[model samples]
Target chain A: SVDTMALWLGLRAVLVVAGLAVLLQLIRGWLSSKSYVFNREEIARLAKEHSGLDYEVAFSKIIVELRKKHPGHILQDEDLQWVFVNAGGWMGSMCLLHASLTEYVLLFGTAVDTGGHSGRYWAEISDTILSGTFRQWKEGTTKSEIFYPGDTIVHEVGEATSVQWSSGTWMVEYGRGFIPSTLAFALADTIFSTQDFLTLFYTVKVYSKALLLEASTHLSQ
Target chain B: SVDTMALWLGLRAVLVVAGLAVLLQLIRGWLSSKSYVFNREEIARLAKEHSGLDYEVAFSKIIVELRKKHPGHILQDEDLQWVFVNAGGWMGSMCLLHASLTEYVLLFGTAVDTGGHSGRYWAEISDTILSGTFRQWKEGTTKSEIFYPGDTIVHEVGEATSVQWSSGTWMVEYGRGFIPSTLAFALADTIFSTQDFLTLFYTVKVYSKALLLEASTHLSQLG
Candidate 1:
């Protein structure tokens, strides 16, 4: 009788532990599979609407439209800070309008000529040129494709290319996917090469704050 | 009798699963607590030795010295590459001499005058000026301290200041700590602001490759 009782107790303990583990795994999987906030068509429409205007005017109009349409996701006016960036081989400055786990929108550009690889990414990326000339070369191709103000380039997931911006290039870019995965590629230069820990610090600081704000917005809704 | 037999089978199954879980946890904990590859004193010595020469000559000599001392850890001649960087209001170019999970050594500088906040970091950072001048200002004070060629500035962990580099400034920088933690600060510009995905991609690619090479070098030394 004693032996039987001990076995029964052991069985109950195992059942409880196993049950909890399975439940946690299931919940985690569900959360991981959550859908992105923005869609392809939505971002394309945004690109088309603001494509050709002077960059300053276009950005202003776009911000108003974004605030009206996605009030919860848009950054407050005071939070829209322009920051300088130099990574990989590209040097430019940008102001983030929106950021989240799955989507981001920003205005980026440089006054000087600069270019680098258009990294292979998990996200769909769209760049609508607002000023200056933007050029792109697909892998294995000698001829370069050039884009002007009002033109847009859509890069599908996993596609990589080389891109160049003529002096004074400016554009609005939108991306939708698992955004965090992109950090490793974005920060690689600082970690492995330049060792510009200051830039690395600000870049992470801003993105993390934006991501948290976006996460909270989703939760509240 | 049949019921007793079923209970014994259940007990055995439970024991196997529980034992496996505990074993896996132990292995993971041990790996997590592993020590960093480099130490502070060794890096400081390297910085001190390479401090005063012209950047190009200094970098070349430093590479030779490092190769002799830590042959397994230094980058090969073919792998030496110069890369441009623009981040946090600073613009410069660098060639990596060494990189690991815990330590990194590189030549970094700019031709144009630039400066930015010296970020608080988890690692000890030593910047040895090979040429040009570096200016530093502490928080809440207007007075500034200046460093000229051959001077070295050591920023201890958790220290933050404002810094400026005069045009044509160049230096050798060595850092020791869990180097990966610095990525967030370095990459924040691309992910949050600049949206220069290309830089992001290349940066990650280079760093990942270096980290793997470092890890392998560490692993191959066994009894």
Candidate 2:
């Protein structure tokens, strides 16, 4: 009789704990789903429309359109800044307009010949070249493919390639996925190889600042 | 009697499921704890020794000493490259020699005046200036403190400040902690504010390559 009673009590305890654990996991997953703010197809269409325009004009139009579509999410003008970055054996500059846990939008390019690994990421990445030539080589392939102005190259999640940008190349890049997971690949060079803590400092400062701003905007609404 | 039998079966089922969940969590935590791979004080001491020397000399000596202490983990000679980085309204260059989940060592500075936010991080950050001036302002205060050549500035975990570097300033910075967690801060500007994806690409490429190399080296030793 005592053994039976003890068994009942143990079962009830396990049921409660297991139930709570599964519930928390579901809630967290749902919360993560809600945090994504950008529309993938809409962003790609906008990028395609501005694909061949002059670099500055394309950026301006994209920003304006983004504002029109996501007024509540648009950042203050001053929040946008051009930052220089060097990683993956390549060097260039970028101006970020939006970043979140799921999506990031930016303009990236350089005025010098540069190339490096197209990192494997947890997101779908699209690059629409506005100027210069972008040459790419898929792993295990010998011949290289070239992308001219207004051309868009897409890399599905987990895809990686070797890419080279000729001098004066510039493009708008859109990524949709768990954007945070890509940071390790983005910053591995700075932290491990280059030792450019100043750059690391600035990189973190800008990202955290923008992310916080977006989070605040998101939560307030 | 039937109800009692059913209760026993239900209890066993719950016990198995809950036990599995708890076991998985503990295993994941243990694996995470094992991934960290750097010594804090040793890195700090090496950084301190190379602090005030001329930029080129200090960098060379630091490399040599690092090789001596961690011969197994040193990178190839050609893997070292000077890369320029601009973030948080600051622009400069760096040559990273070593970085892990727990530690990073590099030479960072600029030939022109630059200043911006000192990001909050999950590591103990120490900067040893080799030349020029490094000025700092803590949050909520007006007075500024200046650090000169050979001086070290430490920002404990979770500490943040505003910093300014004068023209011709250069220094060696060492960070120890969950260095991976700080990447969002490091590459945030490139992704959100700067739109400098090229830089992001390079940064990610370099770091991943080095880390993979280190991991391979570490695993081989255990084997």
Candidate 1 lDDT tens digits, B1-223: 2322343354345445544643553344334433555555665566567666666787788788878888677778877777656554455667777787667887788888776545545567888777888887553232358897667788876565556788888888887765766666566545654677887776776677677767777788751
User: Against the true structure, what is each candidate's TM-score?
Assistant: 0.46, 0.44
Interface RMSD (Å), each candidate? Answer: 17.6, 18.0
**How well does candidate 1 score on lDDT at residue A6?**
100
What tens-digit string does per-residue lDDT give for candidate 2 at B88-195? 446677777777766677778899977655564446788878888987755423235889876788888545555678899988787766667666667655665567
Query: Model 2 residue A14 lDDT?
Result: 100
Please state every model's RMSD to the true fold in angstroms: 17.5, 18.6
Write the residue-wise lDDT of candidate 2 on A140-170 in tens digits. Answer: 8889899987677888764678888876687
TM-score of chain A of each: 0.78, 0.78
lDDT score at residue A137, model 2, on the 0-100 scale: 85
Q: Cα miss at A128, model 2 (Å)?
A: 1.4
